[PDB]
């Protein structure tokens, strides 16, 4: 059971007519937009029962749909706002009360008022305490990712150039920096804990990889600073013998 | 068109039954739960559509009532991959055709800590000494990490990571600030610590 929505991460100008898609072949009937946000749950923007038909949900203002196809259900900002800027979902379902929704993994659409409010992520690692160390034969390392705007970032640790897993915790979300902004930048943190021998072997490598989803060549860039295009933002350290 | 959901918010331990609920004023065709990982599809649990029905999926226990406007979830002998968002949503009810979802219950599901070490620790940049954060780790599950009420300090929630080839799991939080005042011995002051609460030097 697949319901598809790309892209994943999605930066738009204010104002500029922007297309969502989402397309699933299980011949299913009825396709659902919900919104998503902070406080306010998942909020159905439009559905559709069937082809070539479509109604309102609860927050259509703003949006458009169409249903030409039976296995496609684009959702189209016309002139898209910042109070647009949301995670949203595609569901479809058969009809009959019965049945239930198959998700798609969701579209974090961030609407900017200016492209001047994006900003890549700066990243520092934090390395362990010798404090820590003595008293329980660990050392946790703690990675910063600070400075973002849009939050459209995945952190990942590596290890001697392999991705870890095992021993690594990350905020699940990001915090607002500013939080009275509307246009807050963000802040992420994670640990990566290992064995305090392993922290003092000094052949022993460790980098926090952050990917940033940012701006293409499509988006126009006027600013005095590097312009904040997709891309990865490490930091890194080496094991310690003093 | 509105589904209410209690608790909103529910800390529970590792092994411990718990039940969260669904309640609307209107009556829908049928009530569907579902489970929600952080920015990941919600994916399907159950749907409900007769008065009275009581739905069993192993651990996961779904009533409906008879008069078909509450249902319950209940789950036996919560596990830490529990943790997740629990969704009701109601559909139709003989005017129109949407599916509308209430607010969730946020489950967080804490694992057992077999040896809690609660210790706050100072860490610095790789880069620059000058740059630190402060490291609040080893805590039990039921510990409760605060924000902060100055806001030139940033706190984070609790996360817990798992060492897999030491089969040990421990919990942490960080804090950092820019402020001359900012000390690890103060960083979590906003929090209810243990008086035992390692702090060196
Ligand atoms: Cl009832």
């Known amino acids: 059971m697949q319901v598809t929505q790309n892209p994943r991460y999605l930066i738009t100008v204010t104002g500029k007519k922007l297309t969502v898609t989402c397309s699933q072949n299980?011949?299913?009937?009825?396709m659902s937009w919900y919104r998503q946000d902070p406080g306010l749950g998942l909020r159905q923007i439009y559905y559709?029962?069937?082809?070539?038909?479509?109604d309102k949900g609860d927050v259509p203002e703003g949006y458009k749909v169409s249903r030409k196809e039976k296995r496609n259900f684009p959702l189209i900002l016309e002139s898209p706002s910042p109070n647009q800027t949301s995670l949203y979902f595609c569901?479809?379902?058969?009809?009959?009360?019965?049945?239930?929704?198959?998700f798609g993994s969701g579209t974090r659409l961030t609407v900017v008022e200016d492209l001047k409010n994006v900003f890549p992520p700066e990243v520092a690692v934090f390395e362990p305490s010798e404090a820590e160390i003595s008293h329980t034969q660990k050392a946790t390392l703690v990675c910063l990712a600070t400075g973002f705007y849009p939050d459209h970032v995945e952190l990942s640790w590596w290890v001697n150039g392999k991705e870890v897993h095992s021993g690594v915790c990350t905020d699940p979300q990001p915090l607002k920096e500013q939080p009275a902004l509307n246009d807050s930048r963000y802040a992420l943190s994670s640990r990566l804990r290992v064995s305090a021998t392993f922290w003092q072997n000094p052949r022993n490598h460790f980098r926090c990889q952050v990917q940033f989803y940012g701006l293409s060549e499509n988006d126009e860039w006027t600013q005095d600073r590097a312009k904040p295009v997709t891309q990865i933002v490490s930091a890194e350290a080496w094991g310690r013998a003093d | 068109q509105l589904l209410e959901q209690s608790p909103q918010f529910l800390s529970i331990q590792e092994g411990e039954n718990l039940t969260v609920y669904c309640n609307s004023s209107?009556?829908?065709?049928?009530l569907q739960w579902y489970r929600q990982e952080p920015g990941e599809g919600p994916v399907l649990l159950v749907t409900?559509?007769?008065?009275?029905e009581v739905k069993k999926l192993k651990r996961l226990t779904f009533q409906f009532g008879d008069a078909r406007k509450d249902s319950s979830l209940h789950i036996t002998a919560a596990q830490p991959g529990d943790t997740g968002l629990y969704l009701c949503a109601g559909y139709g009810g003989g005017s129109n055709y949407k599916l509308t979802f209430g607010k969730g219950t946020l489950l967080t599901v804490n694992p057992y800590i077999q040896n809690p070490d609660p210790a706050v620790y100072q860490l610095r940049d790789s880069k620059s000494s000058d740059k630190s954060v402060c490291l609040f780790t080893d805590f039990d599950s039921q510990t409760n990490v605060s924000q902060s009420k100055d806001s030139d300090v940033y706190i984070t929630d609790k996360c817990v990571l798992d060492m897999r080839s030491m089969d040990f799991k421990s919990n942490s939080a960080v804090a950092w600030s820019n402020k001359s005042d900012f000390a690890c011995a103060n960083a979590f002051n906003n929090s209810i610590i243990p008086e035992d609460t390692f702090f060196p030097s």
């Open positions: 299980m011949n299913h009937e009825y």
């Open positions: 569901a479809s379902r058969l009809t009959g009360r019965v049945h239930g929704y198959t």
């Open positions: 409900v559509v007769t008065g009275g």
């Open positions: 559709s029962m069937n082809v070539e038909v479509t």
């Open positions: 209107s009556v829908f065709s049928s």
